[PDB]
Amino acid sequence: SDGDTAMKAFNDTFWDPNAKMFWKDSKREKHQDFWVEAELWELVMDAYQHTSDPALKAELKTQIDDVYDGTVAKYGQDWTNNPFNDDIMWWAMGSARAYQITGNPRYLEAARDHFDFVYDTQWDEEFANGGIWWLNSDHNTKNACINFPAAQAALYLYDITKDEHYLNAATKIFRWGKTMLTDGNGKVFDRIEIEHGAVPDATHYNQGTYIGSAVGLYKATGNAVYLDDAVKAAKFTKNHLVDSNGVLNYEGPNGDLKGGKTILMRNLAHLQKTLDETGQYPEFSAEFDEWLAFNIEMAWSHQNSDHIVDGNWAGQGTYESWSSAAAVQALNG
Ligand SMILES: CS[C@H]1O[C@H](CS[C@H]2O[C@H](CO)[C@@H](O)[C@H](O)[C@@H]2O)[C@@H](O)[C@H](O)[C@@H]1O
Fold it and tell me: What is the CA radius of gyration of the chain?
């Protein structure tokens, strides 16, 4: 029931049925940013997968289509005019997932066409020995927020198509990212800037997409090193991106980072499932599961009377859809 209650409340508060987009906040004066809307799209999909209520499930399935339609009405179907490669990839990944749920051809075409644009034209071997550029306008930085999502998108496309091209892409992207965008022990760096080098600033959403791509690669390849990779990044997160009580911390005021627990929780659930199922890392798995449950209970204990939880999970007017999404995500894992 809790995942259902959380998603229903989130939609009540933030879904605009007229524009078929989420509102950016409860003042209902601006719709959500393009990239973030893909992440809310995935939240709808996660609720769809999680729920056991057939009425709600059908409504959510329709909503999957409506989110795409509202975005296409405002932004078009061809996102390759957007200078942000990450923006394109977040939508390509969401589209791959929407295809898996609905079977609608438009989503497979969207996923494959946009993934190909970014991977085939924005990968470069010269600077930093590999990696995808953040932007398709200026080529000054290669970032975790494009590279790990690209590996994830490739893994979904591999699953759908069985075309080894996509598994090879995921493997290549992830190898580069582990080598150049992490410390080797689970701390994921934000980016590498040309003429500077690595910027070793870790954040929830980049831990998350690293963990999700590692878990996906473990499953696709049968190579246990990838599971180990995921575990080390989860451990880092649990010990180093938390407050003194172990609650995942608040990354405001940056608007993009504020809601990043949403992406983190989505991907921590993949690891949780794989550890639970396989029985690997049983000691860590038990600790991890207890810590996840603790975080979820603390976050929800801060819900307001409308069952909305602000993204500072350590505390208490206007609520924002990105920051409020993480608590909903956490109950739909
Ligand atoms: C719009 S994507 C763009 O910005 C985000 C956040 S910039 C923010 O966080 C970083 C990580 O802690 C710091 O390095 C930076 O100084 C700011 O405080 C970033 O994650 C993306 O890689 C990209 O730069």
Answer: 19
Give the whole-angstrom CA distance, residue 294 versus residue 31: 32
Q: Is the CB of 305 under 6 A from ligand 1?
A: no
CATH of 1-333, one of 3.40.50.1820, 1.50.10.20, 1.20.1250.20, 3.60.40.10: 1.50.10.20
Our CA angle for 315, 321, 326, nearest 5°, is 60
**DSSP sequence for 204-217:** HHHHHHHHHHHHHH
Whole-angstrom distance, CA of residue 165 vs CA of residue 112? 12
Residues 222 and 213: beta-carbon distance below 8 Å? no
Q: Where are the domains of the chain?
A: 1-333
Number of the ligand 1 atom closest to the C-alpha atom of 257: 6
Among 46, 16, 27, CA closest to 325: 46
Is the C-beta atom of 201 inside 6 A of ligand 1?
Answer: yes
Angle at 91 between CA 88 and CA 97, to 5 degrees: 145
Give the dihedral of Cα atoms 23, 308, 42, 282; nearest 10 deg: 160
Q: Cα–Cα distance between 311 and 327 in angstroms, integer?
A: 7
Ligand 1 midpoint to CA 220 (Å): 30
